[PDB]
Design a protein around this nucleic acid. Structure first.
Ligand code: MG
Ligand code: MG
Ligand code: MG
Ligand code: MG
Ligand code: MG
Ligand code: NA
Lengths: 220, 119, 148, 178, 48
RNA sequence: UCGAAUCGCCACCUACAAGACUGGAGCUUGCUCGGCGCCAAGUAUAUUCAUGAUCACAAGACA
RNA sequence: GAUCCUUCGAUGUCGGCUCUUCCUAACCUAGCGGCUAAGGGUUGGAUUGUU
RNA sequence: AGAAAAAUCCGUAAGC
RNA sequence: GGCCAGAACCAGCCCUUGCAUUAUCCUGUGGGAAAUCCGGCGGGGUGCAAUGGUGUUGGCGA
RNA sequence: UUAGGGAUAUGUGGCGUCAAAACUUAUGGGCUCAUUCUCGAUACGUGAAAAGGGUGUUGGUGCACCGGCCCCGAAAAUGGAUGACGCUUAAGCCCAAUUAGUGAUUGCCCAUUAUUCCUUUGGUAAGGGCGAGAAAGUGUAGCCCUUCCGAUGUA
């Protein structure tokens, strides 16, 4: 929430609304560790990144193996005062953020700035839905990283079985969002077809040598 | 999907002979094949890995059989060959040609806008 | 590493099999049976005119070969179930009440079990009727384990 | 890739002396990385069999043997390796390559992978190309059938090195970063 | 680290053959301070 | 106060799923039949640019 | 037992009382056909400075 | 400078 | 102001096919249609060499 | 193996992030799935034996044995350690390459080391001289100029 001084400065200056350059990554069907390493290096290089759909990351192996690994992690606590001990976060976005934090140099101001440059969500929230197209990391995708015969696990199911009470909430919100987007995209089909037809028809009216150059370069 | 078989036409993906078309003349093993093409000067008989080929939809069944099949003409006619030639054209281009392409695209966009408004 | 391994089956007239994305749907006189096979990575093919069903494995070790036979057996059981169906019999003082979809047992040597919708249970000595073998066998095994 | 070994022929002799005015001349075939290793293997074999040390010997010639035209053939490689608690072991395997050097390099990689055997413990007895009707194993016999064909699945095809990207648009070929 | 040499990554340059093209070029690093000090054309062009 | 670093934008991207998967058929089961944007509102007939004097934060902006 | 590495301008020594925590090769309690299981329990007195 | 916000009225990313 | 920058030139330094061997080889003319393979006859790709100077153009400095 | 500083190239060790280097290289071959200390994974050095089994192979022949990887055998006291995260179409293990069957030569990263350039200091030192400049000289603000070699260190 902005302060009244910040609002007054903005009003007095009169400049228009500003948004910095932010990359939004759709993390569905990505390998957790490879995605974390790539994102950590980009954060250190100076990018602002927002990751969505953190509950559909992938890990290799069976859910039972990965759940046993998490329980072993959860067993560690400072015996003398557990309120100081390690804090075990159960949500998939917190799991991703902790993996990245362990891949960063966290006890330095530079590493702290890098870690604060990252935002993580489950699903796609309304303040992110309409900001532009999402990206993928092609060198960290499951269909090219795992052999197809081997089993794998989805982060949401494992996190649900170790804690994380909000799986059903996220599922309902995602279903509603996809329904709304599907309705909107079913609309505008006529407009898209009209623009495609206009593009096809303009060739008959533009100059012939321009058409020839387009055909030569393959934009025909 | 297109199968790997004797006489099948393939395109090379990477390497010094990339974006070239040849014919499979012998299956050495699960990973390697022998490729030749009399038409191309650089495509004499050699060994290629199967990670470096893309099968096409033509299979002759050597120079006489290839000429009779006329798969080279069909490949020249399809849209992939057009894309490859356009990529080579874009690669070898000058500032003047880039300017000409820019004005052609701007002309097409303007006329598309006019047609859309008219309709 | 064998290049190609094959297994094929014939389809009786009046029954149809459709495959799409490793999803199998067998339609017969009795009804439709759906099976899931996304955890297999096989090559399923159907030719209606020849009334043949085949499954292929390319460059496979012993395990894929072992999985091919089970796939064929499952498809065969599916077609048999949609063609004629299954009817299991159980017979054992003990008073067992068929009721409707609830099985109650009392005075053994009260145990209650819920019967799934797809299976229709009746008392002649009870009779289990289902369109697929797995559900009927599961119901019989559940009843046996309860009465033990 | 091209094979990492070469086919050499070393011809040698013992230096003539008064007790031995006309010594015997021997011919040796070896697959080696370079001709220094070829000569070393030659003198090891000569000492181990004929009781002739390198310090009283002569090397008459060493040359590299050329290979035949590129044709897919079946090769029989007769090989022997050493490992402790097993003694010397001799095995015969059939490969499928385009040259003798390729078949022997395949054999070396196979022995290293399956038995942890290394170059200085392996010895090659014979290599030859056999006709297609003398193959006794199905895994090699299946490649000379008349109707052999298969599709390419699970292809992890990458991009040209100059076009690789770090972030790309979700359903598009547009690079966002790189 | 040795501070007298710096490493720079340029967009769309992803090969050693590409990075060879840029040898000899000039790089800037713009920033800002807290007070107005002298610049190149201080007297002529006081708009700088 | 305040001058500052940042230098693509869009009611055509900003919906979705699968890679043993990709338009429709046939049986012969492997064969056959993003858009714009880069100096005339648009590819032609036009029109002001200095002396800011040979590099210097772009002396310019928030399309 | 062996040893002699630290400490001789000093690191307070047996038993009991009091109080907390951890282990398992499971005495009881709990499931199986000897196996699993460390979750909760495991007493009060005569003689003796005792263990 | 980054919202698990929004995109005559009210009610419908519709007809409204 | 040799205070700060740019370009140019000298010197030095760093980088950037030949001839040998070509044969277990190449090429025509019983076995497994053809090919892979084995005997008869005829024709022929790897070791060396090829910081220092000497002015010029701007900025700041009245 | 060590005077005060530049540039170039290496040794041991490495090239997913921490952390410089394959923005996760290859147009190389095989093997491996590991459910509560436990799949592996930098020697010296800090994790194990007899016996028994799964997946890929090898002698023998008309079934027996005999090796690669993995599992069982394998039980302790604060919560914890391939360094951490993580990795399985490896970022694991055994071999092999250098931009790949296209045709001569070195993929790249990091030292108080090597080569080279500038400056100091000392010699079992070696030569020359006697418009501002020169002293017949062990040692200075060194009489002046050129040249080569060494330079760490407790008692
Ligand atoms: Mg003692
Ligand atoms: Mg030392
Ligand atoms: Mg790095
Ligand atoms: Mg000294
Ligand atoms: Mg002293
Ligand atoms: Na390490």
């Amino acid at each position: 929430f902005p302060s009244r001084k910040d609002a007054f400065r903005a009003q007095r200056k009169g400049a228009k609304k500003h948004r910095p350059e932010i990359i939004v990554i759709d993390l569905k069907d990505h390998v957790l560790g490879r995605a974390a390493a790539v994102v950590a290096k980009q954060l250190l290089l100076g990018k602002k990144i927002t990751v969505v759909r953190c509950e559909q990351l992938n890990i290799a192996g069976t859910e039972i193996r990965n759940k046993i690994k998490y329980l072993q992690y959860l067993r560690k606590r400072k015996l003398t005062n557990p309120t100081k001990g390690p804090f075990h976060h159960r949500a998939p976005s917190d799991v991703f953020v902790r993996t990245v934090r362990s891949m960063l140099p966290r006890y330095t101001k530079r590493g702290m700035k890098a870690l604060n440059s990252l935002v993580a969500y489950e699903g796609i929230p309304p303040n992110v839905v309409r900001t532009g197209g999402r990206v993928v990391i092609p060198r960290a995708q499951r269909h090219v990283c795992y052999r197809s015969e081997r089993p794998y696990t989805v982060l949401g199911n494992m996190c649900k079985h170790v804690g994380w009470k909000y799986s059903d909430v996220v599922a309902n919100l995602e279903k509603a969002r996809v329904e709304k987007a599907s309705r909107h995209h079913e609309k505008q089909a006529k407009l898209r077809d009209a623009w495609k037809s206009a593009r096809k028809e303009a060739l008959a009216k533009m100059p012939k040598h321009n058409v020839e150059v387009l055909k030569k370069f393959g934009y025909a | 999907s297109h199968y790997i078989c004797a006489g099948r036409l393939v395109r090379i993906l990477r390497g010094p002979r990339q974006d070239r078309v040849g014919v499979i003349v012998d299956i050495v093993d699960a990973n390697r094949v022998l490729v030749e093409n009399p038409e191309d000067a650089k495509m004499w008989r050699h060994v290629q890995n199967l990670k470096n080929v893309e099968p096409l939809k033509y299979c002759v069944s050597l120079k006489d059989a290839l000429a009779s099949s006329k798969a080279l003409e069909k490949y020249a006619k399809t849209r992939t060959a057009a894309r490859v030639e356009a990529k080579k054209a874009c690669a070898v281009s000058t500032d003047f040609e880039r300017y000409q392409l820019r004005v052609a695209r701007r002309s097409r966009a303007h006329w598309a806008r006019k047609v859309f408004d008219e309709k | 590493v064998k290049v190609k391994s094959l297994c094929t089956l014939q389809i009786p007239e009046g029954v149809t099999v459709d495959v799409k994305g490793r999803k199998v749907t067998v339609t017969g006189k009795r009804g439709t049976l759906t099976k899931d096979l996304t955890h297999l990575q096989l090559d399923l093919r159907v030719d209606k005119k020849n009334r043949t069903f085949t499954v292929i494995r390319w460059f496979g070790s012993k395990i894929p070969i072992a999985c091919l036979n089970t796939t064929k057996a499952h498809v065969q059981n599916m077609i048999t179930g949609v063609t004629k169906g299954y009817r299991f019999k159980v017979r054992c003082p003990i008073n067992v009440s068929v009721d409707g979809q609830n099985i109650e047992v009392r005075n053994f040597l009260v145990r209650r079990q819920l019967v799934p919708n797809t299976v229709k249970v009746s008392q002649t000595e009870i009779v289990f009727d289902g369109n697929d073998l797995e559900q009927v066998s599961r119901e019989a095994a559940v009843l046996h384990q309860m009465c033990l | 890739v091209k094979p990492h070994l070469r086919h050499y022929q070393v011809v040698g002799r013992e230096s003539p002396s008064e007790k031995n005015p006309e010594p015997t001349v021997y011919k040796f075939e070896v697959f080696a990385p370079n001709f220094v290793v070829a000569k070393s293997r030659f003198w090891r074999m000569m000492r181990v069999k004929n009781k002739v040390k390198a310090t009283h010997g002569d090397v008459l010639s060493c040359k590299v043997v050329k290979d035949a035209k590129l044709v897919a053939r079946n090769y029989l490689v007769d090989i022997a390796y050493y490992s402790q608690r097993c003694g010397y072991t001799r095995m015969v395997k059939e490969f499928r390559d385009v040259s003798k050097t390729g078949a022997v390099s395949q054999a070396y990689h196979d022995l290293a992978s399956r038995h942890r055997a290394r170059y200085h413990n392996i010895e090659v007895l014979n290599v030859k190309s056999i006709p297609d009707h003398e193959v006794k194993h199905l895994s090699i016999a299946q490649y000379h059938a008349p109707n052999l064909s298969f599709p390419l699945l699970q292809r992890r095809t990458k991009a040209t090195r100059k076009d690789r990207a770090i972030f790309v648009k979700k359903n598009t070929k547009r690079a966002v970063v790189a | 680290q040795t501070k007298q040499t710096a490493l720079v990554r340029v967009e769309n340059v992803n090969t050693r053959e590409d990075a060879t093209w840029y040898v000899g070029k000039r790089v800037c690093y713009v920033y800002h301070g807290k007070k107005v000090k002298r610049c190149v054309r201080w007297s002529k062009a006081p708009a700088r």
